[PDB]
Coordinates of C-alpha atoms and ligand atoms in Angstrom, one line a residue:
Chain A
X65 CA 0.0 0.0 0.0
X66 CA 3.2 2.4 0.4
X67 CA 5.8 1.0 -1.5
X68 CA 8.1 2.4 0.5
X69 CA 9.9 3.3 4.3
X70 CA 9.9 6.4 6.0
X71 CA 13.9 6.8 6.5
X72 CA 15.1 9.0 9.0
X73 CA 18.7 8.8 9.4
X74 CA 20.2 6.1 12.1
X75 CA 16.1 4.7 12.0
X76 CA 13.5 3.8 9.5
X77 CA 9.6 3.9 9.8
X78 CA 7.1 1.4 7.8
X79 CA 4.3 2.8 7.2
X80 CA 2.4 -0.6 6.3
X81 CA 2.5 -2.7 10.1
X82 CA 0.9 -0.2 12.4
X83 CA -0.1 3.3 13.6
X84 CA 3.1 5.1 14.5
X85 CA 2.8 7.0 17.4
X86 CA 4.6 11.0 18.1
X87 CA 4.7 11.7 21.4
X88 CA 4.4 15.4 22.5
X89 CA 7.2 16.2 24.5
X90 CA 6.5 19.1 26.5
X91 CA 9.2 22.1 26.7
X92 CA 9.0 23.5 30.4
X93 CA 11.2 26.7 31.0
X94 CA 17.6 26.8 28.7
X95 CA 20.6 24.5 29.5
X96 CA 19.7 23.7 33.4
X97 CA 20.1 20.8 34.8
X98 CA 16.3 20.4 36.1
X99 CA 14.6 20.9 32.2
X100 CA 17.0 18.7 30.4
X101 CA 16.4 15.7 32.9
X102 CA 13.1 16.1 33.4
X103 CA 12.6 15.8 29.3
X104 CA 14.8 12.8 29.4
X105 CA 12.8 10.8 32.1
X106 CA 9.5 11.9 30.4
X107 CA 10.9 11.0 27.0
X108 CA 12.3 7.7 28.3
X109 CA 8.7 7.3 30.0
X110 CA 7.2 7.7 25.9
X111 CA 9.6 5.6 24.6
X112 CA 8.5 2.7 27.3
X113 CA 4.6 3.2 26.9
X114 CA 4.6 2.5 22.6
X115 CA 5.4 6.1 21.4
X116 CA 7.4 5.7 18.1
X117 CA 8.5 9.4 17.4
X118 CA 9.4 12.1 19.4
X119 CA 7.9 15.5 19.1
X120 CA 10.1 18.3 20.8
X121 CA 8.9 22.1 20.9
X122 CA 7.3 24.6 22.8
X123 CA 5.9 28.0 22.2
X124 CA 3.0 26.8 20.3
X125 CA -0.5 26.9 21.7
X126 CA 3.6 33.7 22.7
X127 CA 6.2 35.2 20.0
X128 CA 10.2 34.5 21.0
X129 CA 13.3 35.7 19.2
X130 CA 14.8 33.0 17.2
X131 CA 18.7 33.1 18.8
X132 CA 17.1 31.9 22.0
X133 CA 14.4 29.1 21.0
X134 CA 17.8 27.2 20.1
X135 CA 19.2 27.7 23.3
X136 CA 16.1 26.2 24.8
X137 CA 15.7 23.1 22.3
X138 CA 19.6 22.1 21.0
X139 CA 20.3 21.0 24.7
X140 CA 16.9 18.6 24.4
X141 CA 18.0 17.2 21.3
X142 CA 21.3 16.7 21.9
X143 CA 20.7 14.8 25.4
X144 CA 17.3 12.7 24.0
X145 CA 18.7 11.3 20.8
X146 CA 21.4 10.1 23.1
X147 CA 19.2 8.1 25.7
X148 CA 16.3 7.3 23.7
X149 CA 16.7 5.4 20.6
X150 CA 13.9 7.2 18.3
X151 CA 13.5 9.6 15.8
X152 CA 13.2 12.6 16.6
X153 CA 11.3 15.3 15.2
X154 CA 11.3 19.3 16.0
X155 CA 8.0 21.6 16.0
X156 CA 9.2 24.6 14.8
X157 CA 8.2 26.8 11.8
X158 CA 11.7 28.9 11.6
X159 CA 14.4 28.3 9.1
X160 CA 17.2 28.9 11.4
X161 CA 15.8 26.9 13.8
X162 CA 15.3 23.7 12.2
X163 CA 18.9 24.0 11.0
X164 CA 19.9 23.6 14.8
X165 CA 17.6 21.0 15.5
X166 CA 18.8 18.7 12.6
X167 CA 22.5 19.7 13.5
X168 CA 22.2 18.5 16.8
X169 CA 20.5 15.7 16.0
X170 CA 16.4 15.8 15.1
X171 CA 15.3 13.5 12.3
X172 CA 12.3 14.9 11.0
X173 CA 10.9 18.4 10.6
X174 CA 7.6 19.5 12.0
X175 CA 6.4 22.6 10.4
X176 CA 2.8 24.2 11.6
X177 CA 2.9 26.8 8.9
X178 CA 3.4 24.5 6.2
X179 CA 7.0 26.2 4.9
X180 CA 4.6 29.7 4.7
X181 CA 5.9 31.0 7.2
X182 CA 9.8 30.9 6.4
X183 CA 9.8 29.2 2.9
X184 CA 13.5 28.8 3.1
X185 CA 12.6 26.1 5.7
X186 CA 11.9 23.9 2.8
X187 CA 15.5 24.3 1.7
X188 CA 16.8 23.1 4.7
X189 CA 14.6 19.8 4.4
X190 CA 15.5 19.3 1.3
X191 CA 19.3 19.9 2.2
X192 CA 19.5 17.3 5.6
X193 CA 17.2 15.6 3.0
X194 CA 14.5 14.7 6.5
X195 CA 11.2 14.1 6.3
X196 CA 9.0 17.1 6.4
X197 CA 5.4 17.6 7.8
X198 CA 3.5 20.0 6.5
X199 CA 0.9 21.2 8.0
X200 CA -2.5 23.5 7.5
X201 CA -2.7 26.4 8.5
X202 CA -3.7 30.2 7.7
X203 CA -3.8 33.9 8.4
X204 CA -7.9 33.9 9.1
X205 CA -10.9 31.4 8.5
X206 CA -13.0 33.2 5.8
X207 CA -12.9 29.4 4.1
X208 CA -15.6 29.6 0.7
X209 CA -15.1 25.0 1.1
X210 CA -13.4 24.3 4.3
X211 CA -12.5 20.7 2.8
X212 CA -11.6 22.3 -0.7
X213 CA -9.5 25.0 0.6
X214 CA -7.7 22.8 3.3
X215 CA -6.6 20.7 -0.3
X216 CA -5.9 23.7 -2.0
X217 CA -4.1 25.3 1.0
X218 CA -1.9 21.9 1.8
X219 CA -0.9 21.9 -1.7
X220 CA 0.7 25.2 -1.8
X221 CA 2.9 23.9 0.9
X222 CA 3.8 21.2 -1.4
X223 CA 4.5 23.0 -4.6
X224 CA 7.1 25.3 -2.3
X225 CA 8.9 22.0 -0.5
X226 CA 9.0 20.4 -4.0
X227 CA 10.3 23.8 -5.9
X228 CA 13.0 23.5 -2.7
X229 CA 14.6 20.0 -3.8
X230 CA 12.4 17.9 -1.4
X231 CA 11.8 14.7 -2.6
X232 CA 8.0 13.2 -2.7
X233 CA 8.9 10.4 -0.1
X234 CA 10.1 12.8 2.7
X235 CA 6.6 14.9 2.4
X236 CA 3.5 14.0 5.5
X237 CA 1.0 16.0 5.6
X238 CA -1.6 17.1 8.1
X239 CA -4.5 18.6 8.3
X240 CA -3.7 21.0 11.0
X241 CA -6.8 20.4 13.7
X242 CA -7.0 23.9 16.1
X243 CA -5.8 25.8 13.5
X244 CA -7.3 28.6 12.1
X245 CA -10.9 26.3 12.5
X246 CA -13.3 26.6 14.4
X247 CA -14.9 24.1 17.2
X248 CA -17.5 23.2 14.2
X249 CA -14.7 23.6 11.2
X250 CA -12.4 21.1 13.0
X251 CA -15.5 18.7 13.0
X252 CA -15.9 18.8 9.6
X253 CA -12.2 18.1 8.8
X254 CA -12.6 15.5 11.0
X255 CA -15.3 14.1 9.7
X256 CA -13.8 14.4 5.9
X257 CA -10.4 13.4 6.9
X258 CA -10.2 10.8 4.1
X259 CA -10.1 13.3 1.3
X260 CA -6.7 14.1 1.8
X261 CA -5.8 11.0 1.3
X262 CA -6.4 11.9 -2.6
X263 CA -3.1 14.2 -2.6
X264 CA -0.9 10.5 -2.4
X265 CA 1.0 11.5 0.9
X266 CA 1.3 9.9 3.8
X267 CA -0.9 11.9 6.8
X268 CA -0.2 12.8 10.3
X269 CA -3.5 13.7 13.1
X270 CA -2.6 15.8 16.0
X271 CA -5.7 16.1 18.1
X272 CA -4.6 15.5 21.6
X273 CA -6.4 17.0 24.1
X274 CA -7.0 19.9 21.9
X275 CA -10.5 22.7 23.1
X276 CA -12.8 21.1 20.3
X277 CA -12.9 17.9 22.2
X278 CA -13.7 20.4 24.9
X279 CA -16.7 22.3 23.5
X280 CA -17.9 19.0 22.5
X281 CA -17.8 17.2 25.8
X282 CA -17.6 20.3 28.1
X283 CA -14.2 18.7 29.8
X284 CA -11.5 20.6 31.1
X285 CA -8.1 19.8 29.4
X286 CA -7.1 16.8 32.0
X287 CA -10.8 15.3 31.5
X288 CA -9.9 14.8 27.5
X289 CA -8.4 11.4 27.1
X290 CA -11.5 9.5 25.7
X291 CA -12.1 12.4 23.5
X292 CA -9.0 12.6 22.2
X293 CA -9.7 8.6 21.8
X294 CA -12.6 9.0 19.3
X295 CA -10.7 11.4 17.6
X296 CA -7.5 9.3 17.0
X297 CA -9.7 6.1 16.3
X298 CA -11.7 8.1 13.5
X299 CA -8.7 9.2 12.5
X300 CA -7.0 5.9 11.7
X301 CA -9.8 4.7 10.3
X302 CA -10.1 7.8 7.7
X303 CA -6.1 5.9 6.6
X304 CA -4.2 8.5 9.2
X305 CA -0.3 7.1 9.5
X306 CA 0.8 9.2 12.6
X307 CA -0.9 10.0 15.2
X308 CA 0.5 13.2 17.8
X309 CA -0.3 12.6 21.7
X310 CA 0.3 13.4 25.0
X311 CA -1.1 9.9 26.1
X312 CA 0.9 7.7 25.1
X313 CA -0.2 4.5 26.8
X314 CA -4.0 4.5 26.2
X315 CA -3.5 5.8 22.1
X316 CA -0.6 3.0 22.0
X317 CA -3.6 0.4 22.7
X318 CA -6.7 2.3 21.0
X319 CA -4.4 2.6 17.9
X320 CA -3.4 -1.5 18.1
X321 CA -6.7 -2.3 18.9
X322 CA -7.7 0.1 15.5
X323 CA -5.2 -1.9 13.5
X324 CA -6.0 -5.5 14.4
X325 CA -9.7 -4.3 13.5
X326 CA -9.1 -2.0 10.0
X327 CA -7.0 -5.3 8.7
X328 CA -3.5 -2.8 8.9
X329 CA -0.7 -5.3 9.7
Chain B
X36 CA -32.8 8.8 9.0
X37 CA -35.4 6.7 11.2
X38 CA -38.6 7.7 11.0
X39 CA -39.6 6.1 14.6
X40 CA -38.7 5.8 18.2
X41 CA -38.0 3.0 20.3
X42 CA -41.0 2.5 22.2
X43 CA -40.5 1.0 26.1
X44 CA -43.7 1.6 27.9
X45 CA -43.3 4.5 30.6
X46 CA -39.8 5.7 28.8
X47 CA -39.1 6.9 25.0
X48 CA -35.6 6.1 23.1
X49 CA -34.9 8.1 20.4
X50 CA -32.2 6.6 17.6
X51 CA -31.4 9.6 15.4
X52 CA -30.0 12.0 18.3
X53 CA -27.3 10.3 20.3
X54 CA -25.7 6.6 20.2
X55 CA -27.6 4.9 23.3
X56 CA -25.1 3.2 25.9
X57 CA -26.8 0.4 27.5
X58 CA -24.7 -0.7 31.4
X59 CA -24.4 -4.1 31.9
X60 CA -25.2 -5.4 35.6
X61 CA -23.4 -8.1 36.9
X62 CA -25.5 -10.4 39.4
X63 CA -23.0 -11.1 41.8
X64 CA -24.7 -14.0 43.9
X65 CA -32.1 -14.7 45.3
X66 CA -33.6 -11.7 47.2
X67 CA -31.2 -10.8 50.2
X68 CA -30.2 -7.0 51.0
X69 CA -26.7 -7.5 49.8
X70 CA -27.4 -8.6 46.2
X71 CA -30.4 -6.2 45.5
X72 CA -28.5 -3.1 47.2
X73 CA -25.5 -3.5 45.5
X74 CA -27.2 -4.1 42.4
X75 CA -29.2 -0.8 42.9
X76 CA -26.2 1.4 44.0
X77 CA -24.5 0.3 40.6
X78 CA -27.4 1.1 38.5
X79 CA -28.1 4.5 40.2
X80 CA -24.0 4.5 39.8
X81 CA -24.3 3.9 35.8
X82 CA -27.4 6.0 35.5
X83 CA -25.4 9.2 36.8
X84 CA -22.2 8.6 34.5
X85 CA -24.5 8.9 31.1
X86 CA -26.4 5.3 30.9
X87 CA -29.4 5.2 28.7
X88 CA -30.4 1.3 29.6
X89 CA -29.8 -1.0 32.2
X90 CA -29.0 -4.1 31.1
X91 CA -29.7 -7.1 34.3
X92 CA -28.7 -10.6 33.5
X93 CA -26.3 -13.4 35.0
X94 CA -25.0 -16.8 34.0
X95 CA -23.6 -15.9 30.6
X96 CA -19.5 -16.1 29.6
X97 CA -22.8 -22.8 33.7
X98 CA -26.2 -24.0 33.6
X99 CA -29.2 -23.2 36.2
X100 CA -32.9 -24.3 36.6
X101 CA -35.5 -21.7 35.1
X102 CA -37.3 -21.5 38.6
X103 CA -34.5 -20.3 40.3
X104 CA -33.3 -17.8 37.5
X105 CA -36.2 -16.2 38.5
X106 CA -35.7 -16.1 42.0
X107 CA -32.4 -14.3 41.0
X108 CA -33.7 -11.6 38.5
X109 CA -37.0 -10.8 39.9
X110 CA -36.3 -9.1 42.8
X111 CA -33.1 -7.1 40.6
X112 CA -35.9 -5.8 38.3
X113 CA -38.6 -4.4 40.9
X114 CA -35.7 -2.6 43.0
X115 CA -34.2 -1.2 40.0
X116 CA -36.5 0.0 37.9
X117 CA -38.3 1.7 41.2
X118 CA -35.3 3.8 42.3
X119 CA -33.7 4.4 38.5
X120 CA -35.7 5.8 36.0
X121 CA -34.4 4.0 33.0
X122 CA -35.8 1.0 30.7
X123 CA -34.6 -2.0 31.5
X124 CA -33.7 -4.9 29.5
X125 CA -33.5 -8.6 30.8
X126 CA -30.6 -10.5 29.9
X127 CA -32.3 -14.2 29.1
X128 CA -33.3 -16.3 25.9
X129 CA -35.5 -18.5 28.7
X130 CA -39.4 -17.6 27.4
X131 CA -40.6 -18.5 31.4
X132 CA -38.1 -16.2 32.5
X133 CA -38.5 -13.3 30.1
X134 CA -42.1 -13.3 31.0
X135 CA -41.1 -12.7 35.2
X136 CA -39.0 -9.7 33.8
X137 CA -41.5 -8.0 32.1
X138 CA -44.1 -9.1 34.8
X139 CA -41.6 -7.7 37.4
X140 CA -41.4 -4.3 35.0
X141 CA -38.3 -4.9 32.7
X142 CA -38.7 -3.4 29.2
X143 CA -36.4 -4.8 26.4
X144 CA -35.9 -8.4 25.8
X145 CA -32.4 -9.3 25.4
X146 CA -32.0 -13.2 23.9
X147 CA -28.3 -14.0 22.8
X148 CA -29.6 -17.1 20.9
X149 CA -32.2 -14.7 18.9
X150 CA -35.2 -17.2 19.2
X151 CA -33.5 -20.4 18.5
X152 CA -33.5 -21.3 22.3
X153 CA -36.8 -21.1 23.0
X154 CA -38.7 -20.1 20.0
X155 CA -41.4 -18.8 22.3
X156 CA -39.6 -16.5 23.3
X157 CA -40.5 -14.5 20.6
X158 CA -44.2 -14.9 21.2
X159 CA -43.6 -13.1 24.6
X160 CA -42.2 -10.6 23.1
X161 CA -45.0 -9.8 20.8
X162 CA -47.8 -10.3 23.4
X163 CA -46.4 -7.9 26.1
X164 CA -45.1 -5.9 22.9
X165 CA -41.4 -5.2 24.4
X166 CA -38.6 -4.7 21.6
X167 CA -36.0 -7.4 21.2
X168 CA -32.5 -8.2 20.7
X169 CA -32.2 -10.7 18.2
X170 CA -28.4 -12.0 19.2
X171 CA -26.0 -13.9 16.3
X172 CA -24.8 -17.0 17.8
X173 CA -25.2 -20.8 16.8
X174 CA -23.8 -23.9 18.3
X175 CA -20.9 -24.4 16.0
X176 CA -17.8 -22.4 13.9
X177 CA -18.4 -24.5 10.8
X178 CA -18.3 -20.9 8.8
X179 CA -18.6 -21.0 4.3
X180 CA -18.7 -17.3 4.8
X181 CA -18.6 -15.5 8.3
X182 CA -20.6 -12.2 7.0
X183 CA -22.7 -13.9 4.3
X184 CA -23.5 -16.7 7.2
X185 CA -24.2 -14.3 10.2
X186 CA -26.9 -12.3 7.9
X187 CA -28.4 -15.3 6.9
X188 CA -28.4 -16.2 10.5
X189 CA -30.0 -13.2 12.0
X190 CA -32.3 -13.3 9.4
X191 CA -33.5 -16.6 10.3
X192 CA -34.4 -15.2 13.8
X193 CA -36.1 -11.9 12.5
X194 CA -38.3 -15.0 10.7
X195 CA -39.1 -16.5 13.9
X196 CA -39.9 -13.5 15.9
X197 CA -41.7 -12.0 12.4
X198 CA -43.9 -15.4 12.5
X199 CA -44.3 -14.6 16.0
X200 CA -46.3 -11.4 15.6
X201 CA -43.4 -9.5 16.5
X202 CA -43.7 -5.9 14.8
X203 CA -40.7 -4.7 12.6
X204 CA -40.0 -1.4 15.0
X205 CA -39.7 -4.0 17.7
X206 CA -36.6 -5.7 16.7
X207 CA -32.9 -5.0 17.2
X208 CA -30.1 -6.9 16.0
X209 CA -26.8 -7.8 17.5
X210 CA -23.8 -9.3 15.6
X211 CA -23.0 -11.2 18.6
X212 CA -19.2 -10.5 18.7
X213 CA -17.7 -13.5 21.1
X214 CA -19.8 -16.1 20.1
X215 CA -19.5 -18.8 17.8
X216 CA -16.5 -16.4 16.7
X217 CA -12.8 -17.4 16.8
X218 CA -10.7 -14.3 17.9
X219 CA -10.2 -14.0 13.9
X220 CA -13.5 -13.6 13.2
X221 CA -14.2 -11.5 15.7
X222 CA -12.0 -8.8 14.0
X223 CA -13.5 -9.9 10.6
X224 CA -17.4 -9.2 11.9
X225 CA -16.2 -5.8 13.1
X226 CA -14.3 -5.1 9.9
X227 CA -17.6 -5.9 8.3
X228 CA -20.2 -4.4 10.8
X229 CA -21.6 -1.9 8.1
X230 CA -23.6 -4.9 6.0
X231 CA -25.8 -5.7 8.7
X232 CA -27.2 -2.1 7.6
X233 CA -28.8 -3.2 4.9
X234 CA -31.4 -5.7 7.0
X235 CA -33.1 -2.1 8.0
X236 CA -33.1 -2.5 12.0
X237 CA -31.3 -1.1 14.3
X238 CA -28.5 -2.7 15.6
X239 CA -26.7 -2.9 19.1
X240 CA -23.1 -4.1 19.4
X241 CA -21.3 -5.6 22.1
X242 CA -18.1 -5.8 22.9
X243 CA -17.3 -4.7 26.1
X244 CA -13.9 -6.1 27.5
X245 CA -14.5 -9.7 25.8
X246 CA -11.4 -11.7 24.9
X247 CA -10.5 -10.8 21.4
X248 CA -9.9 -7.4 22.6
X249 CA -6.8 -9.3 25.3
X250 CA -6.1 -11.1 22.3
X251 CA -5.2 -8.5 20.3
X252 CA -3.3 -6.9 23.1
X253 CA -2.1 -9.4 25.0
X254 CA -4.0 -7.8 28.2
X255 CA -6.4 -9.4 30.8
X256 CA -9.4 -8.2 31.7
X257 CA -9.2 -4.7 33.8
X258 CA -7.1 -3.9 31.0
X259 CA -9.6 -3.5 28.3
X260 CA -10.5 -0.3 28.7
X261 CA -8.5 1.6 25.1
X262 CA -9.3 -1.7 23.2
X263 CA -13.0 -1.7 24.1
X264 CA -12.8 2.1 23.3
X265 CA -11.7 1.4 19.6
X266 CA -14.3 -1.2 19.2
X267 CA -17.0 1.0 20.3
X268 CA -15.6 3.8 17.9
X269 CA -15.7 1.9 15.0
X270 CA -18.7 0.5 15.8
X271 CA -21.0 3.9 15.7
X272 CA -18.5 4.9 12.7
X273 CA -20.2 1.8 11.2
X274 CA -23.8 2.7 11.9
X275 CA -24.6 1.1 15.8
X276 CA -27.4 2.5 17.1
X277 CA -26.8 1.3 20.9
X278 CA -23.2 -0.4 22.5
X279 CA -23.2 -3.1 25.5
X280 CA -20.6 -1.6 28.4
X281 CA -19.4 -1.9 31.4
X282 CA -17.2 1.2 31.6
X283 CA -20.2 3.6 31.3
X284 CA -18.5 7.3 32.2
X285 CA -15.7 6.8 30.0
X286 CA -17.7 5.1 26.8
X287 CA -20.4 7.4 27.3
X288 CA -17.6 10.5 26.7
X289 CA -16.5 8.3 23.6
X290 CA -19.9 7.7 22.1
X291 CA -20.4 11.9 22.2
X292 CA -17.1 12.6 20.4
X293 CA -18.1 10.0 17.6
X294 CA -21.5 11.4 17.4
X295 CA -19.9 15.2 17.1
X296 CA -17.8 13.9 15.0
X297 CA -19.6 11.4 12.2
X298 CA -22.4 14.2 11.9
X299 CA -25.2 12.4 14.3
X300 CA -27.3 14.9 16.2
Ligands
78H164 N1 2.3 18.6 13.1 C1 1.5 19.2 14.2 N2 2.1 20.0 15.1 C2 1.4 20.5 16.1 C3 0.0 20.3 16.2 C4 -0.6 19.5 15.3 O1 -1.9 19.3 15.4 N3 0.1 18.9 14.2 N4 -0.7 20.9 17.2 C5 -0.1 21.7 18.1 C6 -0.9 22.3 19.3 N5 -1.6 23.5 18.9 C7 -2.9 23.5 19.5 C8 -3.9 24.1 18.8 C9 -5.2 24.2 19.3 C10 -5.4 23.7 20.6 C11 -6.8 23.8 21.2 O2 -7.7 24.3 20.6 O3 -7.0 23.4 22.5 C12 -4.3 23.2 21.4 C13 -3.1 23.1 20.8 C14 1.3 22.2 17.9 N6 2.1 21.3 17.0
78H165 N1 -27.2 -8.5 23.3 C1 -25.9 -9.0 23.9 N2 -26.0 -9.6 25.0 C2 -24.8 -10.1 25.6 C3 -23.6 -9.9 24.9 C4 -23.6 -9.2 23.7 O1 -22.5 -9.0 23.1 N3 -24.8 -8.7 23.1 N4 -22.4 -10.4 25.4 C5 -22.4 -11.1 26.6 C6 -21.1 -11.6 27.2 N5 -20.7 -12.8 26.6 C7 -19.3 -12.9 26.4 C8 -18.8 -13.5 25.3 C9 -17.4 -13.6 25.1 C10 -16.5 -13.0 26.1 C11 -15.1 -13.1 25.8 O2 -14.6 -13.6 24.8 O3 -14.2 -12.5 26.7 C12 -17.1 -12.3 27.2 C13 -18.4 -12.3 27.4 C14 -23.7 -11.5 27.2 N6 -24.9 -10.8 26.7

């Protein structure tokens, strides 16, 4: 069904067997002694519970200068990759950034602007030749076909990666849930997930414990792990590759459980 | 998308709105205060965490006289459906002991050998007028073709009940997942669920923590809670009107993701 591996460096990633699992690693405010063990143990903690990727970066969810987000995530990256034997993937949008990341040892690129924001991320990608994800996302939300203009959208991010030098097989996409979408927008790409499956990528979902499950449920953010549940079975059953969560444990079995039933593996 | 409601006497169930979660009772053993108030505190327990039917029935995963099933579920069924206002289903496919229930106020037969027990069963079903789940299950595995078979199957049931004077908004089917199923076909009927769709009736599924979900990953029982989760989810993705649980607050906040999600309500 793919006819080929996700290669990321020292590891590789099929694509056919199972689900493959990011797990968020949260960036708590760099260098000291207190954040950088405290993202190991919590890593090491992912790694044991089924996670198959690690996703490290903060400042998502504020607007930092770009020569001290490095300060904050090289140390991360550098001590991670070093105790956990995973791939490794950074969130950041920012050229210079990513260059760092890669440099001190992150495997795959995780861009929320889709290379829109700093196009000349694209050219790093294509340089370290990693797998990129590029995700949807926008300025505003005055969407004429929220499913047509998420296709159209996505595939602007692909003509600038491919224009860059990156090669088809290091391109995921996603559709970008919380972004730019409202509550009843990010049900509707949910519930039309499987059209981007048309664009011949392979597709990452990153739902976890995001407010829509919220408004839906009326559940604090610590009361979301069933939502988040649904979400990530619907998901994988719309042909999702990756899925991005905080809870690692329960998605690890909801995901298997998924497989064994969709006849994946 | 159904143009009537579930009728149970005093209450009113309503198929095109929300997925209905039906809680299963366990009848730890008839009459004394400990059985009947535990019984009671769990049902007023289920009813508060999003339940829409209790479901009261023991002796099922041995083989007792009728008489004294009776003794057992009769005095479950008064308490219970005086102190939780909720339809109640009996969990039986004895016709002398479906008629107690009802007698004793229960309102939804629930037969897992869909008439083929006790073919008069149906016939109590169509005099006191209750709906009924029609169950899949047969005394053998000797499958030609596990999908083509179980519709044939059921519909040799809705026959029975049909011939029965049973009415066609009475009847609810049930793929009967964990019976007559190795843990391979299990998988294979959920894969499939969807084609028992075009019978017309609403269907109920139920799944909750059975062995093919350990099976899959390699888990005992108080361990089921993500893999029953995924079942559920692909279940209502599939078209289930009503799922059979045990874990009622955390497949209840399941069940209203999906429905946000798949467009119901
Ligand atoms: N590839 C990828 N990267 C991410 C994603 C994501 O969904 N996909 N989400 C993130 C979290 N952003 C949020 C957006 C909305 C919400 C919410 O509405 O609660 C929460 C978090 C950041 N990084
Ligand atoms: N309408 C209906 N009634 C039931 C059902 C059911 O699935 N549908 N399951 C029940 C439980 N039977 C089991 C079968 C298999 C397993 C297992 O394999 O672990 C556990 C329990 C009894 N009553």
């Amino acid at each position: 069904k793919w006819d080929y591996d996700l290669r990321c460096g020292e590891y590789t990633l099929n694509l056919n067997e199972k689900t493959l699992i990011m797990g968020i690693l949260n960036v708590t405010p760099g260098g000291s002694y207190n954040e950088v063990d405290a993202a190991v143990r919590h890593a090491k903690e992912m790694r044991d519970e089924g996670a198959h990727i690690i996703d490290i970066g903060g400042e998502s969810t504020a607007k930092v200068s770009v020569e001290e987000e490095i300060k904050r995530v090289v140390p991360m990256i550098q001590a991670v990759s070093k105790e956990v034997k995973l791939p490794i993937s950074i969130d950041t949008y920012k050229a210079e950034v990513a260059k760092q990341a890669i440099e001190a040892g992150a495997h795959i690129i995780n861009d929320i602007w889709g290379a829109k924001a700093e196009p000349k991320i694209a050219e790093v990608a294509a340089h370290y030749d990693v797998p990129i994800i590029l995700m949807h996302n926008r300025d505003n939300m005055n969407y004429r076909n929220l499913m047509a203009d998420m296709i159209a959208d996505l595939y602007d991010s692909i003509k600038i990666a491919k224009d860059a030098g990156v090669r088809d097989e290091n391109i995921i996409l996603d559709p970008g849930i919380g972004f730019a979408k409202t509550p009843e927008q990010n049900l509707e790409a949910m519930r039309n997930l499987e059209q981007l499956n048309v664009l011949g990528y392979p597709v990452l979902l990153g739902t976890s414990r995001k407010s829509f499950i919220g408004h839906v449920l009326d559940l604090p953010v610590e009361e979301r792990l069933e939502g988040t549940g649904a979400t990530v079975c619907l998901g994988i059953e719309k042909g999702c590759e990756f899925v991005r969560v905080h809870d690692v444990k329960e998605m690890s079995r909801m995901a298997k459980m998924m497989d064994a039933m969709i006849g994946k593996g």
